[PDB]
Amino acid sequence: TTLDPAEYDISSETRKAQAERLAIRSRLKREYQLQYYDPSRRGVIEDPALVRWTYARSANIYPNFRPNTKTSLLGALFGIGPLVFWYYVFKTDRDRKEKLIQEGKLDRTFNISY
Amino acid sequence: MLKYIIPTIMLMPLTWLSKNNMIWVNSTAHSLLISFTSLLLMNQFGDNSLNFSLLFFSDSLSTPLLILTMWLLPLMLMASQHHLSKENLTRKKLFITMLISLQLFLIMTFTAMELILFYILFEATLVPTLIIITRWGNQTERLNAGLYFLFYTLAGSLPLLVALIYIQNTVGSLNFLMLQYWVQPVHNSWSNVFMWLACMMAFMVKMPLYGLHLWLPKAHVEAPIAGSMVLAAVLLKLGGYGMLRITLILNPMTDFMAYPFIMLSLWGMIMTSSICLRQTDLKSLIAYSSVSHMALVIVAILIQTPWSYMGATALMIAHGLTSSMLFCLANSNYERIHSRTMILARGLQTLLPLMATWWLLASLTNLALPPTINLIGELFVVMSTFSWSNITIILMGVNMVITALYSLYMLIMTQRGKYTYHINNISPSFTRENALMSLHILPLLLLTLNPKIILGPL
Amino acid sequence: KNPDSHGYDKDPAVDIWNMRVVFFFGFSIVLVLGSTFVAYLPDYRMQEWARREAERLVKYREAHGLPIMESNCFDPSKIQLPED
Amino acid sequence: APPLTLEGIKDRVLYVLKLYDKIDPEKLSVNSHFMKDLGLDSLDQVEIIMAMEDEFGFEIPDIDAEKLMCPQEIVDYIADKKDVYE
Amino acid sequence: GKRLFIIKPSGFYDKRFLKLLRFYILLTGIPVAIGITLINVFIGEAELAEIPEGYVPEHWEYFKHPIS
Amino acid sequence: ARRYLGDASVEPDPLRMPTFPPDYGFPERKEREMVATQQEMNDAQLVLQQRDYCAHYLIRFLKCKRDSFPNFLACKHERHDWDYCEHLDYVKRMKEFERERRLLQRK
């Protein structure tokens, strides 16, 4: 249960032409340490993956949004739905409890509080 | 009374009239003094409330609430000092003036003697606040926070003045609250709902329901330097108390429709705190606390039957401090590291050891350990709102769980090893860092000793 | 902001003045000198007055004939009570 | 607090490697280059670190296997792990 | 002999602080401290009974306490 | 539960006993088994299910207990005989599965 998580799979020898998946990263950790080792810096680093981490997450959706797919009209099943339910639960109570407070006395007489 | 407005307006030319850099210490010195006057004639009754003039009873009401309002002013100039030292003095003379120009009305309001001085002074802000948000922002998204902050607050508070001028000429004179001694009820019609709905919805748009809060994190996320007016805007909001002056009376007997304001904010209380867990921006993370256990008062106020006002008052000034102070931490830790992104700051608690116990006592008062005001302000909520119907124990019982995972995840994110690349963060919290961060936890917990000074009449 | 000056607020002098003007004005003259005020401040909401007077008056009735905690609707037959 | 030096690690490693009857205890200790005593590709390199874990006992990282050519190289960096000689 | 070098970021700016509280918070504390005992020793709240006080008693100062 | 008649004073937690509370009783042996004086039963401090049989007996047990304070033992024969009052009672009450067994069988 969650998950296999595929600690072995097919391989060998295909996709041994795939190389320079590290050249992508090896460039940076060379450049990053070329950044990170300097005598005079005293300050944080740009780290763009973080700039594009929030700004492509918090903002930049209602701009990207379109009110079309009915899996984006899904939310009526989520947002409004249970909010009706909680009305259905309560409004029955506060009444069932009220009717008895009139005809018949459920409480004791040492309840002043309330 | 004039004991107050006059010195605090006398402050106004205590500032520019001064010399060069002496200005900050000049006004911070005096601005503390007024606090002796603040208590001075106040904390009289008690019973048969104080009204000392025709159009002012300063605060009698057992809503003292005014002493805080006079605190937060000379907590700003200790707060606001950081990056505001980098532009000109004739502008720095301004930012201290409008900031006072706010403080003068919050003394006028909370007294008001009546309804119609309240309103024109209830709308009399937004001139001083709006000018602090738009200028001296940081990001460029600020320009929209300027509008959204209006077009709600002002949007539906005009229907007040249609209604309050409708009462003035209907029954007698609203000139005075202290005469309601003639009030007829409001039975029903398709007209009276609107009356009750017009005399209400303007207040909700300030202390948010789970709808129409769409502005609250828009203004706080991006907002002035120190939280300079962000401390003030956490006073402004709770100041929607005036619903305590109305809904006690002035259409007492419609509870008929209360339910769409109960089940709407009662399922949001369990809600918007939960949409606060994955936030990646810290001054957002606190902004959604401020909705949550503020929006609990709206189910305290609508229900009648005190033991709610016992507990509803303690809350307005409960987070009045705790929710204030957190915006003071997240400011400081931002001075040194210029991202507000929560992730980036980690591996603290080694490098600033004394500021350890500052986070803790803050994040501990959302947990609300029993002895402090916080619970003794929540456990008069639950005791009456239980009697309403027994089932309220569940949701607002869940609130007491998700809020605990809520707070810790903010502290425990700052306990880790990170040395990482930061050559910054040298300053070991020069005194103002820890001075202005105090004058909260000292006065806050303190009140628990004699906590009969925060209570309503009931 | 450390040329090995110590410093708190801004610069050489009144910074040193600016610390004593917050610490001393801020507390020890308010969080203490003031806090004293409300500590023993006089009877708040007239309850102190109430304990005794809601004490004395218990036995006065209990002594001779009278009941305790009537709730008789404040002397009826002062009220004509509209029926219909 | 337990005192640690660079001698024992030259001894202990010399010791059990001289304990195995698969190795004559006339053979080189500090430098054999271990490729003379690598036979075969496996059952040496990972074989020798099977015992040496039984005394110190930290993890013997994988990628540090290829440092094990030089018998002075194994003892070399074990000083850097446990915070050994000055 | 066997020895190392302790490492702490700073103790001085924290120790230079706490004083300005602890020094000042007492400075008006202790003078306010005697007046909470001495002022009560020679002077205390008594008693009761009753009084008609002739025409009317004084104004406020009906309290029972040293300073109240 | 012998006399089922009313209670002059209404004090429950049976400060109104039938007369004295038994476990069940009588039915025949013993028709009146007899316990101790109630006026002294709750005049001392006596817990419930201390109002069963052997009240007279166990009231003495604590008497000597209070006598020698710096002592770990008072009477190990009485506490033994406290069974001999109680064991004798309990075994006398083991007889109610004997009668009902053969009484409720054939006849």
Place this chain on the structure above:
Amino acid sequence: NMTKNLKYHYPSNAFKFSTLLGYFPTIMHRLAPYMNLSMSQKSASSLLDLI
């Protein structure tokens, strides 16, 4: 002695161990921080409030 000193009962791979784990701490703590944190939030998050 039957565990250690015995006749060499082998590391026979097949048994049932739900015993040494308890197996409750395995899935739930992989679940309660999924079905809630990532469902009633990522919906409720800027997914909705910003829409």
Place this chain on the structure above:
Amino acid sequence: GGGAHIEPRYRQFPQLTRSQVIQAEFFSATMWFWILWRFWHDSDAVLGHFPYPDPSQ
């Protein structure tokens, strides 16, 4: 440094202090002596025996 007061072991099985074990062994009595009074005098059950309530008469 601190001191040499005991050297470690290469599995030569270090020596004891000789007041280490005796001072302990006197507390091997306090279980074996305090177990004295178990069977003296108490039996597996000190009870009294239920005599099979035969009188259903």
Place this chain on the structure above:
Amino acid sequence: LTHQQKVLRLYKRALRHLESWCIHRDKYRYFACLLRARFDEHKNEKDMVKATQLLREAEEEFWHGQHPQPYIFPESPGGTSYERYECYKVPEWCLDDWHPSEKAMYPDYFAKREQWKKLRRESWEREVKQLQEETPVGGPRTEALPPARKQGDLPPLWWHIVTRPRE
């Protein structure tokens, strides 16, 4: 990972999970050669598919027979009191903010520090620019020439070379 050494990562762990199953110290030792027998059964044969069934079926019969709560070697990738001591962690470069009268102590040590910096004060002009000569375009793993051709100062100075100790 090159096909040659792929059994090692299994050959490392194979006996590893074994010992946590055995109890007596001989038990591990007695099954050594006996279970060692299976490795060289086919000692020299094809590297490809022929002997890939020594890799293929190694999957099962291992994962089957896995998790008898292994011995974790406490200070290591997991298990108790591994990363335990962070209350020091040696925040190297704690030497900045002081306000001396806190700097009276360790005068000989303050003397030594500023002597280390001269290397890192200027080692760069040929330290950095050689990395513009050393790696032509897209170079993989980024260390310099191992000497840096005359004197490395450090060159990796000092973050990796002066880094934090354990106590």
Place this chain on the structure above:
Amino acid sequence: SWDKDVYPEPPRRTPAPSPQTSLPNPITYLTKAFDLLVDRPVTLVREFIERQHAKNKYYYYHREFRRVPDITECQEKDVLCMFEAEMQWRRDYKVDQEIVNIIQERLKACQQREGESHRQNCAKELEQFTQVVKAYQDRYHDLGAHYSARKCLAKQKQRMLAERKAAKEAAAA
């Protein structure tokens, strides 16, 4: 102290001694010891000020109001005359809270005073106590208007229901 009949309590019944025994009792080596390290630093000081306090005697009086204002007067719309008719009613709702406090503590003195019986004694408090509060929330408790306290406007309009319903509509009465 206090007023006896305001806080009555049953008498002491000091327990009789029962030494019975030949063995030493340590309390007599403490109550004879503890007393001698207490009285000197303690009792001398209370006597020390209580004479030191003979030098000055203050006064604070017993505050009793003047009741003319009645109840159900006066002419409906009025302000002046109905400002006070609450001041009668408001104080007399601050009293009737506390008279529930005093009567409640008196209850506790029925328990830990005894606590073993808890049932066959006291004869009074509980059987009285629930005859007290049932004389409380009726007509003296404006509910659920307790938030507004609805002074004298709703105070009688329970008690109109306690008139316009009871005693007449009771059918037949």
Place this chain on the structure above:
Amino acid sequence: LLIGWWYGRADANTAALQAILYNRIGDIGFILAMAWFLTNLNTWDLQQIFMLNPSDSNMPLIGLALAATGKSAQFGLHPWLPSAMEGPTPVSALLHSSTMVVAGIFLLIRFYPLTENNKYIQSITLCLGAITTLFTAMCALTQNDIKKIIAFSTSSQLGLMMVTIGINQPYLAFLHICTHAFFKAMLFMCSGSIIHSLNDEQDIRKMGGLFKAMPFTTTALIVGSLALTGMPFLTGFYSKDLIIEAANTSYT
């Protein structure tokens, strides 16, 4: 603030967020029986409730049985203890012996005079605590750590306590803890010289035998670790022994 002693150690500070997650649920009950008494009895004083007895305790009490299980480490909330051991050793000695684990079954004792009625109450108790035992026991065996097994040992000590509340045995339940607490502080604190002076392991593997320079401490184990076994003449001879021989005659 204790389990969180060591920073870093991604397990350590996530053993805190456990402790304060599961207690807060177990909190949610005891604020229910804090409410119920007002709306009915108009006090929470432990004196007054016992003098003026509640009729229906069904709802107000079941809340209490829930807060019982939070800190008494009952079943279904249990996963917290075995990971509550990740801190310093003398911590768990103090946390788990006489304190913090006792309140869950402590609090229910204080309520004896009122709880003696209403078979619903008594019913769910012994229908619960007994089940806690065999999920802890069946999870004890095979476990490899000194500290862990000594964690479950006190986990299953609970099942006997909570049962004794189930049958009405107010005092004979509490005498247990008074006695028991003397054990497991010793028992843990014994293992100190085993863990530290071995430089560490806290695995049950790589231990060895009884006597290698551990003469006294190994006598401490075989006394206590004998005592917990059913008390032949020893300390708790009046604790575990007077239960299954007394309440065992009942409606069980």
Place this chain on the structure above:
Amino acid sequence: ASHITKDMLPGPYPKTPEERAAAAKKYNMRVEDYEPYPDDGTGYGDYPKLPDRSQQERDPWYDWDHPDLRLNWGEPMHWDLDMYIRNRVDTSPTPVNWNLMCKHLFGFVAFMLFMFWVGETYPAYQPVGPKQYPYNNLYLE
């Protein structure tokens, strides 16, 4: 002050090779299967072009994993995909998808029926019929 084209723009197909990698290299070759594709079920504005998603799951695993740092501490330069649930999630267990707990949690549910009976010890079962008599059956005296 990153100037132009900070984040995702209106995908999720605006010349898939133009994005990864123009900047923000999620894929190297514009097909790593890291191409800024995973706009699965769009029309939800959620996750536009995004040099981003469905890259796999269950943890950064926080082990030796030591090119430099590689997982949760030490921050490799730029991979970031989705996160924030990753500090409370790990990988594959030994067994797979066996609910024997619902079995055992219902294991006692077998003994629900053991609840409907009693445990009264004295006397024994002694198969009876009309011998039960908890209190009394026939006449009193």
